[model samples]
Target chain A: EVQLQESGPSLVKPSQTLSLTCSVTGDSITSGYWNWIRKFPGNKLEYMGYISYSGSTYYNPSLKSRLSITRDTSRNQYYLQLKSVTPEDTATYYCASPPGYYGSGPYAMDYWGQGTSVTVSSAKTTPPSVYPLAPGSAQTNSMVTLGCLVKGYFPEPVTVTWNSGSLSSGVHTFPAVLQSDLYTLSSSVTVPSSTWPSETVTCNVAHPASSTKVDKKISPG
Target chain B: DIVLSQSPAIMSASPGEKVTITCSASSSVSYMHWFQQKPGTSPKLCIYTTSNLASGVPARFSGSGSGTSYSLTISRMEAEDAATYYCQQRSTYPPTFGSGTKLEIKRADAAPTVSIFPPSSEQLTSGGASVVCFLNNFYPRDINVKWKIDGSERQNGVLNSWTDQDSKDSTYSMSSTLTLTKDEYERHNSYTCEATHKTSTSPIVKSFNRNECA
Candidate 1:
């Protein structure tokens, strides 16, 4: 008879870390192999890696940069540490005991823990806003296309909403695009310049934590 | 990571023949591990850290190597020992395993000679007795040996089967051991060494009388 239990913090701040522990019972941690695996929201399971009794470890190539699996022989436990977490990283993390115990052979996860769920969030300040690409691009005199640059935020599902005095009926907004290196995003919308001069366009950035909300308004003169 | 290349990727020999496999590493590996994986079966550790044998492996199966090269030699070939041998370097990361050396035993080309040695007088009265069933000068080393008391089969004891090869002629010689209790020694008048090989029409039985030993 063997048993595995996973213990960890339920909430993690963005740019922070999440730690989990796996406690094993009914057998000596010395004899078999211990593995740390996690499942994402869509039920996609990832083989995080394994730690053999001898302290030999082989982590998944993708997550090896941010993941570590270790054990304590005295406590009969093993651990998993994943750094720099985000909302997309939230999932049910499991500590598993695979068959045949960590060799170069194929083995299946025969024993598993009930799993632990974790959430990642941080609401320091709503992203600072800036106006980009407007009257400078006179693609058409009848309409004005503008973009808002929101920078410095952690965790996501960040919401960016636009508010302006309503007038133009043929207005459309494009989905936000994240920059290459920074955690910043840019969103753009086109409105008929015939009605844009009178309306004050404002970009509102909101965080799910309900703590930070920033509003930037610009009258595209 | 160290890369290991094995020689003679495939090899086949008779029961009385001997086979040796070699592995050469790209860099000097701290230790080496060898495994025996029969067809369709998981591999079992045979040698670890160069020369140490894994649990339950016979002495005849020996490994020796260091630095950039190592070898695993099966002193005498047996039918059940026909399997692929893999060598791994444990000194580097991502661990590298050799492609493997496949050993196949064809058929027995010569018959084995069996000689049974009697237990000492002291061993007979002490309740524990050991008998040696030594078989020698055989070809195509794939041979099986067992012991029987009176007329029934006896399975308890160690069976040491190994082959000595003439590097020039590629011939083989093997041996085995059977142990018994003092009560078994006195109760049975007949002890037999039964050998099975591809060259024999039926199991070769060599019987010995207990009284003859005394």
Candidate 2:
């Protein structure tokens, strides 16, 4: 019935240290090697590092400079500390161990702590670049669908509108996707083909992070 | 990510013969862990963090190695040790698991003893009630489990723990659990756990009713 529980702050300011603790029960912290693993928003998993029973530590070379794994044997607990965190570090962190007798053999992690989520708050803001696309191939005899592509925005939250909400009936806005510390999103709206050929349709983007607003207009031939 | 290559993908040995399996990683790894899995069962941890034997594992099992090479050795193989062994590396991103080494030990078969357990009072009072069916002392591993509620086949809310071998007895045990919503539990529907194994001509079935607990 060995168990591991992770505890830490759910949010951290950018460039600050991110710290977490793993509490152990039904086993001793001095008995086996402990590890820190994380899963990013896109399901990418990273094995951060491990601290062995005798206090020796091994870290992923990528994180070696800013990562520290330490333990407090008396409390049957271990800790994970990552320095100068950024939005890219936002992920769910887990504490794991093999939980076997020392000197026997290396074993896979059999015990894992329920994960704790950590989100690195953004320190700066960047507005999105909005582009309204004409109903190119999506134009039908009776209907035409206009598209808007919003790219390179920081601090995810953004509002998208079609024709200032006048053309909301068939509007679809996709969830924002993170890439290289920024976010991208796409949205579309459908209107009658006859009306769009002569009418100007506008795609408006409102970014709260930068307190900026952008609009793009398109009229398909 | 590190690529782990396990040697001797398959092997066979006598009951008292010593056995060893090796794993080589394409790149250096912090440590390698080993697992044992029998047919129709979940993998069990045998060795962890390179060379430590998991609790309750037989002393005959040992692990050693570092860097990119590691090995798991069994001082003397037993009929119960007939299974597949896997090695995993957690030293890098996207941890990897070895393909596995299958160990065969000639042995006969045995039928299982099946039983049903009703949900505990705590569970009965919760949002749902869980009923468990256990199959024990079975040999040759492979088995299928089914659950029926009120004479209707049930698939949802059913969870089965893969078989586990008892080293001393060389037999296997497994459990299947069926969860019922609080409303369903209060309705007092009949629940059945059925086990089908090659050793028996007919499937073993066990039934549980909430009213029986009263």
**Candidate that scores best on lDDT:** 2
Q: How high is the lDDT of residue B54 in model 1?
A: 66
Chain B TM-scores across candidates: 0.54, 0.58
Q: Which runs of model 2 end up more than 4 angstroms from their true locations?
A: A1-58, A61-66, A70-221, B7-14, B17-108, B119-127, B162-164, B186-189, B208-214
Identify the CAPRI category of the predicted complex in candidate 2.
incorrect
lDDT computed for candidate 2: 0.73
Model 1 lDDT per residue over A148-200, tens place: 44444443446666774342332222223223222344444456676565676
TM-score for all predictions?
Answer: 0.33, 0.40
Candidate 2 docking DockQ: 0.04
lDDT of 2 by residue, B1-214 (tens): 5888998887767788999999999999988988776654445678878887775578999989989889999999888788888888867755667878878763457776665655544344457666656566677677888887877788866655543345455565665656678887778657788888987676788675555434
Interface RMSD, all candidates in order, equals 40.6, 23.6
True contacts reproduced, candidate 2: 0.09
lDDT of 1 by residue, B1-214 (tens): 4778987787777776678899999999887788776634344567766887665577777888789989998888877777778886657655567777767666436676544554544334455555555555566656777787787888856445453343333444544445566786778877777888876567677666766522
